[PDB]
Amino acid sequence: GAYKYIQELWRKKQSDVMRFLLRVRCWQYRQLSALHRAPRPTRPDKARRLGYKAKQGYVIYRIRVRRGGRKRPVPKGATYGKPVHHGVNQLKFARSLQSVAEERAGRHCGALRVLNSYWVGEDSTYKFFEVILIDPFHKAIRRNPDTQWITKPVHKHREMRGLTSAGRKSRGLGKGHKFHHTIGGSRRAAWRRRNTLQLHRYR
Amino acid sequence: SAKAKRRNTTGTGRMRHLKIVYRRFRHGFREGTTPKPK
Amino acid sequence: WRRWHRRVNTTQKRYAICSALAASALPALVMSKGHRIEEVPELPLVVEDKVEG
Amino acid sequence: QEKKQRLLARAEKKAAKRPPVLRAGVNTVTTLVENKKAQLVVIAHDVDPIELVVFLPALCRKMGVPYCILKGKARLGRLVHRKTCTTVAFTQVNSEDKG
Amino acid sequence: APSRNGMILKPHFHKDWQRRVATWFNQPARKIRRRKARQARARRIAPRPAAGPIRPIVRCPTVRYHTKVRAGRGFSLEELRVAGIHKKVARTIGISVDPRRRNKSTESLQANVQRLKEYRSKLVLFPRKPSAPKKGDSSAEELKLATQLTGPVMPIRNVFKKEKARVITEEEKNFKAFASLRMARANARLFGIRAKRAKEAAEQDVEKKK
RNA sequence: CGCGACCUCAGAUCAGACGUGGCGACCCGCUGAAUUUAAGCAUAUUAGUCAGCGGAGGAAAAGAAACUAACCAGGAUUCCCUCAGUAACGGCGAGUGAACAGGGAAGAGCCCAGCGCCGAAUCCCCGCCCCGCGGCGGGGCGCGGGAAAUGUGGCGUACGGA
RNA sequence: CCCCGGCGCGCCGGGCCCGGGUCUUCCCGGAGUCGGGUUGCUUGGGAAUGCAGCCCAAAGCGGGUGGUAAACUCCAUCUAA
Ligand SMILES: [Mg+2]
Ligand SMILES: [Mg+2]
Ligand SMILES: [Mg+2]
Ligand SMILES: [Mg+2]
Ligand SMILES: [Mg+2]
Ligand SMILES: [Mg+2]
Ligand SMILES: [Mg+2]
Ligand SMILES: [Mg+2]
Ligand SMILES: [Mg+2]
Ligand SMILES: [Mg+2]
Ligand SMILES: [Mg+2]
Ligand SMILES: [Mg+2]
Ligand SMILES: [Mg+2]
Ligand SMILES: [Mg+2]
Ligand SMILES: [Mg+2]
Ligand SMILES: [Mg+2]
Ligand SMILES: [Mg+2]
Ligand SMILES: [Mg+2]
Ligand SMILES: [Mg+2]
Ligand SMILES: [Mg+2]
Ligand SMILES: [Mg+2]
Ligand SMILES: [Mg+2]
Ligand SMILES: [Mg+2]
Ligand SMILES: [Mg+2]
Ligand SMILES: [Mg+2]
Ligand SMILES: [Mg+2]
Incomplete structure (x- = not known):
């Protein structure tokens, strides 16, 4: 039951123990490159409850993403339009920094399949995420029925289509009165349905 | 430029390999067999 | 998406089937439709059910 | 290797008791400590991430299980015929070794 | 522009x-495509009913529809338990199961239990091996005589x-439906405030007393 | 000093694999105007639309409730009819605008981590023998190599489970 | 007249040594996530529908929802990351 203790310990992120580990680890992650293959999960309990298994064909990558919002990439701040669209600062990006992290791992390792990721550190400038990827051609993966699903071509670049857990959170999905925007599967699916004129033969 | 996309899209050229795929598809991409000899 | 199709009420469609049948049993109307029925024994013309086979 | 010989010997015996052993793994040792079934817990000094065992010394003390810290997770690895081991535990010993 | x-x-x-x-x-x-797939599906699963698994009886929510019953999604685990049908076995013999649904009242529960017992009585069960029958x-x-059934199974x-x-008895003649209705609304409307006023009065009188 | 484990990290035309580019009607993720309407115009509208970027598949996405309700209750997702130009939003102007219930199309449900028990009971690769071999797998044998106690496999997952 | 497929029936070598009910004793959950403030976008969502950045930062008869902000109190309904 060690994973029970570790999970609870990683909930005390302002304790003396955990603050010391986060601070020194963030320092160490900061001296490496923005994309860096990790030898093992820094968080074995968090990794495994996100689908990671300790077998050949599962790999970890540590991604560093710059913190903060999204500046509008217009020259000299000119947007050339109406005042409603003059904003340059204080704009936010539609997707989380964790999702950006997974996309940067998924794009680099185009032959792997991103599964999930998790938080490992941050300072004022960077957030650090470890991404769980799978090699879809290792026979430890192809011959396991419980992981054959992610070797299918329909699961190529999940992180790049908002399919991972981090990515799908910015899509406004969910059941109930809070998520009417995406009835039909997505915002555009709801829009097309609500904006298509049904002209029946007999009308 | 829709006009520019149809000047150099798939089909405008030779289809050297794609049009043999279209023929092979109709027989399930069979390989390693021949019609029964005379 | 021109409106190519028309709804006709069922009661009126059946009305139209009844008028067609009533007008089909009158020699004057059938002759006035161009049919050569000057020697048909009777109108309406009923034939035995053997013909169905 | 020698599990194969034990299994084959049982096959011959079938045709014609568990001795004490070290318990390895922070998950196995943890359950044993909580159950008070462990007699002595040996913990590697250089487990990394340290959170894997950072709680174990305090847990053993709460349960009254004697524990020690040893230099080298590789030395505990060599005991269990693996590269590394975070911690091991004695649950039972033979009578000649009780002292 | 508007005109008159x-x-x-x-x-x-x-x-x-x-x-x-x-x-x-x-x-x-x-x-035609949907019809051609209903027929091809009916042939595939014959002699099992073409409509599909039997569905339970449920009452439609809200006050506009609670006078009507319709087919639900599946029988509740309490209905299946009372009828003595294992929940994993239920689907294998054409019974639809809904683990989400609750049973608040007994009548609805017993209505669907009798439904399951009647359906179980009409069930013709082919042996797994044709030549070797078994207990049930x-x-x-x-x-x-087994033949495929068309239409919903035991329609609701x-x-x-x-x-x-x-x-008509003098007691029904003397009943005042409108006065009863108006006073029932008022009592529900003033119930909370009346108790609050009553509680204060008790405290108001108690303080003088003691 | 030397030797040996481990950890972290390197170089190989190392053995065997895999990604790249295209097409893009339909699909998913971003980013994203201004003509225009408001008889002017700045919010608003145009419009989450054009343009731009990324990623797919024969479909995609979604999907088995941290749901709807407030009923005598329903019961994953998607689609059709209706709800409904309605509740609501709006220089409350111009304009915008869903959901639940109800009737249908279809209908299918499941799996981990965790908590535990099982002597790691698990997996990959090499070499030899039999079978198959244009979808590279089945069985047998190796005091063959590695992975894996920093946790593989079997039981089991909220409908409870052991 | 060719070929491909589907559906059936036997042999060989393997794998499984498989379930229901009633009691008894035990066990049971996803965190820089929820939630809150603020900013920007977005929505019919209006003392703030969804999303995102920064700050704060959980609990365990708890947590979320219950379309008007908030305290107290019952209820209903689910079980997020
Ligand atoms: Mg946007
Ligand atoms: Mg899919
Ligand atoms: Mg959130
Ligand atoms: Mg005029
Ligand atoms: Mg090579
Ligand atoms: Mg104008
Ligand atoms: Mg004008
Ligand atoms: Mg103008
Ligand atoms: Mg504007
Ligand atoms: Mg808009
Ligand atoms: Mg476009
Ligand atoms: Mg492109
Ligand atoms: Mg591509
Ligand atoms: Mg394709
Ligand atoms: Mg979901
Ligand atoms: Mg549904
Ligand atoms: Mg109307
Ligand atoms: Mg709009
Ligand atoms: Mg509905
Ligand atoms: Mg139907
Ligand atoms: Mg487990
Ligand atoms: Mg559930
Ligand atoms: Mg969950
Ligand atoms: Mg915008
Ligand atoms: Mg708007
Ligand atoms: Mg209220």
């Missing part, structure tokens, strides 16, 4: 609606209890 009397209209044609017009000329084609399998004489209907005419 008329209605004020706000057509929603201020977008590129012609880029998203859905015509229905494929409607006959869809009807139907007899060969009733396997010959709203049946009304006819009440015959009876002599």
